[PDB]
Amino acid sequence: KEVQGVQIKTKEFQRVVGWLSKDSVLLQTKKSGVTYFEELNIYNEKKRPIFNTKESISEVQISPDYRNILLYSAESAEKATMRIIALNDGSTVASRATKPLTTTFYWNDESPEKIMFVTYSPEWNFQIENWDYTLDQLDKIDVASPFISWYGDNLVISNNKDKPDDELGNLYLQDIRDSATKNLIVANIMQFAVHDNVLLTIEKNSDEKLLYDFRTGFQNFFSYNAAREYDELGTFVPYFDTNFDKNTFLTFVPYKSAKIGAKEYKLVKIDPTNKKESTILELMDNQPILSYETGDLVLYGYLFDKVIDTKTGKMYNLINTPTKSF
Secondary structure, three states, X not given: OOOOOEEOOXXXXXXXXXXXXXXXXXXXXXXXXXXXXXXXXXXXXXXXXXXXXXXXXXXXXXOOOOOEEEEEEEOOOOOEEEEEEEOOOOOEEEEEEEOOOEEEEEEOOOOOOEEEEEEEEOOOEEEEEXXXXXXXXXXXXXXXXXXXXXXXXXXXXXXXXXXXXOOOEEEEEEEOOEEEEEEEEEEEXXXXXXXXXXEEEEEEOOOOEEEEEEEOOOOEEEEEEEEOEEEOOEEEOOOEOOOOEOOEEEEEEEOOOEEOOOOOEEXXXXXXXXXXXEEEEEEEOOOOEEEOOOOOEEEEOOOOOEEEEOOOOOEEEOEEOOOOOO
């Protein structure tokens, strides 16, 4: 079977948020002031309604276990809500009221009852809290950086920069219940990510290269150097698939180190355990990518409207824009 696309009017299509299963995605559209969330089958075009709202959408995330959605939305300039919605029937599992503030969310993969979030406002700069939505519990997280990730049930890693404009920082591990537990685990890191028990770090390695390290007790088990791009502000990091594991890490890679054309990258698949690198496609544009837990299909694009098959190299239009306005 191959991916079949559906046509959606340009202004109506908002985005594909991500995968819901090996053969379906979460589709967001809007019409007459109502935002609709649907499950869309990638092979047969069947749609299933999940939830709809007239509220302003700020963030939508799919839970690590693909069972729930987090919706952060605002009813007005004075009221916003974070809701957890069940994918199977669109019911509200939990909700909390707040103010419409800029927020970044981190869903705990090990204990998906917990969502940590960073809120920003000029009154306090940034702050971090953990919401256990199953227990109606909100706890402060005393971590001195907004660059964070869960590492377990009660552990968070943060990249602590000495000055806010710094490219590099130092990675610390701490238990969210007690900041006295803070401990340096990796020095001089620019960017990091965690997934499937792997800690990915990215750091400059001379001005000509970026170094991607893969760590388990933080045992460093593979290194990959890519040509380094940079822009007017510093190092440029191409997109990678956040859904990586010990055997699959997908990233765009530049052809040469240079100051930042739509054919400037190749898409590669790295297997850090097997120490192998394969090019999926050459002469591509760097845009977001997201894989599923299983199989070789990867959403591609700022709106995730295309699918790349990483086994064959074939690309498919999942959401088609009409060729003309009609």
